[PDB]
Write a protein that binds this ligand. Structure first.
Ligand SMILES: Nc1ncnc2c1ncn2[C@@H]1O[C@H](COP(=O)(O)OP(=O)(O)OP(O)(O)=S)[C@@H](O)[C@H]1O
Ligand SMILES: Nc1ncnc2c1ncn2[C@@H]1O[C@H](COP(=O)(O)OP(=O)(O)OP(O)(O)=S)[C@@H](O)[C@H]1O
Ligand SMILES: [Mg+2]
Ligand SMILES: [Mg+2]
Lengths: 461, 463, 433
């Protein structure tokens, strides 16, 4: 309490030393005096440009509120201090924010540099969105980014990108949120594609990617987690995780991993959310999520999809490829109808994305990706150069298992190669060119920059 | 708040007695003065070695952040007091600790005792790192540690040791936990190996080893134990149990003993845990246990594994523990069809197979049990216990394959320890008690006194 | 209570300043004195015309209920002040509302302008009622009403209209609930006809519509949703899905979206819906369904119409009513109870080429106008594009197939062109395939 009053007085008195010391020592930057003025506003009204600058550096809010409701920008423009107004605008001050009396800083601003600064800030705010729109669609389509992380699944990537672009440009039913369903065998990038899409939509914003694993919603009462308990009940003050996260980021990508595990009541709530487009928490607040993107992953028809894709590959080899026809989708549909038992739920789904089991070339690409990851990790951590040959890739892919997808290749690479590297690391490995070779059927290693097979550090003795 | 001010004033005055009294009363050891100095900081700047000693004894933190963001070590070094700097370093102060401006205590030190002491502490940190690395280079007994407690199962030991070594030396993806599944007959060391691995990884730390008896999760709704109840239901405030335990020790060894007893819908929750090591409790908090180790024990393919091992050993007897495609053709359809989904098995890094003991391994088990009992007798009653090879043969004759080492354990308890406990009624004294086979070869065995020429008496129960 | 007392005293004394201050401070405009009279009532009896005006502007209700139970209109009329009565009526006061003693304001009114004003308000109410009746009469022919927003299904529309007229005109068993079973494939206007029927019959917004998916109703969900989990059961969702909405609109149009997927228990409880209705709610309330409209639907009989196409081809286009009496339905749904009580069965026919192309055209028109930069919309070859689209004929699950055809062959192309910045304005279509 004393520190806050001292900071307020220092801001009023334009005391650079006191303000800096209090801010560095943990004093609340936005401490509010009983008269309604914080350090930033008292600094702005008194033309304390240095105090305003230091407060902004510490995290002061220039948009935080007769001058009732006047923010720091309002007082800075009132004081006719162009430097203070510019500094506050640099901190995110809104030149059109209205105080309790409805007066914006522009209205309080006197003709001169203050008005120009406010107009420039408003123009920058307006044109930032245009710049983002121009940059997003150019030189970096979603498909381009996805192809970096995902191997194969070209049709799925194209479908997702086309749908996303349609939503972005408005050539779509903007009255309803965009909904996807991902199907296929295991270990083929459903969750991976969803995560990459979320990252691309929201860059690095964690709040932009709401992750829900439906395996926790196998019971009827689990729906409470979406919206929280009703008033007066245990934990009602937390109105569900989903509602809070959505209101934090309306256009967040929502992933319901393994949706098939969810209890039917949960699916009913999901369908209500999709059709309505907004959800009401347990506190009576309703949150609009029309622009949100919902992605669902499951393996309900995985076996049918996989065996049909393998049959189509074999049929194409009789011509010597895999484009699954809509009739196979009609054949699959009854399975989905039986599992979900909600014909409206399936109909509400905007897109069904099918992932195919990998072909041999895609397995080779997967093995190469894993080896590259391990090689770069070794180079970074221990300055070890790792090399391999096509034969090594063939040998590793020989361990592939269709029922597990990329996970099988990952585990095979780890056990066959990485185990040897770890065993030899403590004593033999050093910076240089370590190359993997095949003797007859097993993977062997070569000495750094020399064709000498390292002696394995036989455990025990 | 007056207690904090009094403690700060006492510390700045080099008053050990007042500082101790304030600390005992309940004054915060890390109380911060309005000028940024804490009690330890003001003690250090004034060369108050006794004050620093008493503050550290109460739990003072010398690494807490122009003197902006400085540390008690910085102030002690600035005053150039060897004793105060030494005490602060002994209390956890780091000469590599950096203040707001980035200055380290080494920088503040002037040539003399303080500079040498700070260099010594920096070398202590660096050599701690290097010596941990050197030990890890030497730390290759995990196979030895296991073989101390486990007999046979060489393939399982090798697999687990290789995976653990890989994880320990880096060389492992941090985006996915490490998962094992242990398969085989009953009483062959699955749970034993899991417990030994947990002990090795976390020494004696109880929080480091998390145990779950999946036989208690035979119902779909029982999954709530992992994550707790949702908001508005009994026990919601408590939250998940497994989530709490994982929060305590993120890198703990998790053991789902007898997992095939669980309802498949309960196993369903393990998909995320095994893939990304993330679980969200009933309150919506993720635990992010990426670097934990998950071990599952089950006997689903017990009969197939045992039969295949017996057949392989019979074949090898013509003139050892390898199965290449037998796993995929035979074991996999069992595991998948009767209990699991494909995606669940896809997340398991390694499947470990335990095979039934060979005859020599049975002899080793019998010797292990006899050694355990002899150790107990010597340690407690100062009784030395001896036996012969024929004793081991007779004991192993009672071995039962369906029960594994438990059969031998019970046999030893039944046919030997019962006689030892009955002889312990004043017929056992601290001498070389010897166990021998009677004239009836492979039929009976008796105890002999400290002096071997005398057999132990009838135990005279029907008094 | 202090604010209410102050407002009441100010209204009684005609203190405009005090009334305004109390209203601006949040005092209840409809504050009720312990003796039964409110601020508006006392202002009215005292001829405080300005106080009544300001109270009404603040939201005062002049219909709030020996003068016990008298409304503000009653008190203004008793005071014989024309201005106060006019102001109260302007706010919605009813000149015929009775107090607890059964005395209307007209009875309290004395000869003068008050009589004329109260009778004018009564005439306004009567004219409103007559206007609603005339609008409902003009709603006929309901066949045209439905055809305004539906394509095809003329037979079903005519049947529904005739049944509605018969029930309205007393030529039906009005004592018994009214129930249709709708038969055919999915997505052929069943839900569209039910929704249009609800929109037209009920005044607006389909407030009286009630549609449910009987596929989610099972032994574990029958009472918890259909009747709604009553008190003392696992869950407290009384009403659940059906009777929670029937509490407001007893004459609801109620759609059950697949009886092939309905549970035997729910199909049995649905037996209450017939005879007299009065279906038990989770709260225990029962609704007389003799006036309600139930629309069961199924696809189990979807073949009976599609396989023939005679009911469509031979219905005066260029078969017979109940060509086979309940062919599959009796064996499946126990005609003795469930279908024996159904008053009528409505067939739904596969969409014709003309109907399909009309749907395509309407969807394309929507998309054209849906365009934000409509200047770029030319719709050149729209008829030909529709001809191409209908090639993917709806023979699978309903008009949603045609909607997906339109989305695939049109929307994607336009989005791609927009992304390629090839749409400045005056843009034609493209004939693919
Ligand atoms: N198409 C892919 N390209 C590159 N890596 C992939 C691909 N698919 C999977 N992976 C990797 O292998 C791992 C497998 O996990 P997922 O892709 O998310 O499983 P899935 O394909 O969705 O099938 P389920 O859900 O287990 S039945 C991922 O974490 C990826 O790192
Ligand atoms: N040296 C050893 N080698 C193998 N097993 C041992 C050894 N020493 C002790 N055990 C026994 O191993 C048993 C635990 O192993 P488990 O394989 O989990 O048996 P289990 O619990 O019956 O297995 P299942 O899965 O339930 S069939 C305990 O009875 C231990 O006493
Ligand atoms: Mg996944
Ligand atoms: Mg066990």
């Amino acid at each position: 309490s004393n520190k806050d009053a001292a900071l307020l007085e220092a801001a009023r008195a334009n005391n650079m030393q006191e303000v800096s010391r209090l801010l560095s020592e943990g004093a609340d930057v936005n401490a509010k005096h009983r008269l309604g003025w914080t350090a930033l506003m008292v600094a702005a009204i008194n033309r304390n440009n240095s105090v305003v600058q230091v407060l902004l550096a510490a995290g002061a809010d220039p948009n935080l509120g007769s001058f009732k409701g006047c923010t720091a920008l309002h007082y800075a423009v009132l004081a006719d201090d162009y430097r203070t107004v510019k500094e506050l605008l640099d901190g995110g001050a809104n030149p059109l924010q209205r105080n309790e009396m409805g007066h914006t800083p522009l209205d309080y601003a006197r003709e001169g540099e203050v008005m120009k600064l406010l107009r420039t800030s408003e123009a920058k705010y307006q044109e930032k969105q245009r710049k983002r729109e121009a940059e997003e669609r150019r030189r970096f389509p979603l498909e381009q980014r996805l192809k970096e992380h995902i191997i194969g699944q070209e049709s799925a990537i194209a479908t997702v990108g086309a749908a996303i672009r349609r939503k972005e440009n408005g050539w779509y039913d903007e009255e309803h949120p965009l909904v996807f369903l991902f199907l296929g065998s295991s270990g083929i990038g459903k969750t991976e594609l969803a995560k990459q899409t979320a990252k691309y939509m929201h860059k690095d914003a964690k709040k932009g990617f709401i992750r829900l694993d439906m395996s926790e919603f196998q019971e009827r009462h689990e729906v409470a987690k979406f919206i929280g308990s009703p008033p007066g009940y245990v934990g009602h003050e937390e109105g569900g995780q989903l509602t809070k996260k959505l209101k934090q980021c309306p256009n967040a990508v929502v992933l319901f991993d393994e949706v098939d595990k969810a209890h039917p009541d949960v699916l009913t709530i999901m369908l209500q959310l999709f059709d309505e487009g907004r959800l009401t928490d347990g506190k009576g607040k309703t949150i609009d999520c029309k622009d949100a993107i919902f992605i669902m992953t499951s393996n309900v028809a995985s076996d049918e999809i996989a065996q049909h894709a393998l049959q189509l590959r074999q049929e194409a080899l009789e011509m010597s490829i895999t484009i699954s026809k809509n009739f196979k989708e009609n054949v699959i549909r009854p399975i989905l109808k039986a599992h979900f038992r909600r014909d409206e739920f399936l109909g509400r789904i905007n897109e069904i994305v099918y992932f195919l089991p990998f072909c041999h070339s895609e397995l080779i690409q997967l093995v190469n990706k894993e080896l590259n990851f391990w090689a770069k990790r070794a180079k970074q951590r221990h300055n070890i150069t790792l090399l391999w040959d096509r034969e090594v890739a063939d040998v590793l892919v020989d361990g592939y298992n269709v029922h597990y997808g990329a996970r099988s290749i990952k585990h095979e690479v780890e056990r066959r190669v990485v185990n040897q590297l770890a065993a030899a690391y403590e004593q033999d490995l050093l910076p240089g060119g370590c190359t993997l070779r095949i003797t007859v059927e097993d993977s062997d290693k070569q000495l750094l920059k020399s064709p000498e097979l390292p002696s394995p550090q036989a455990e025990k003795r």
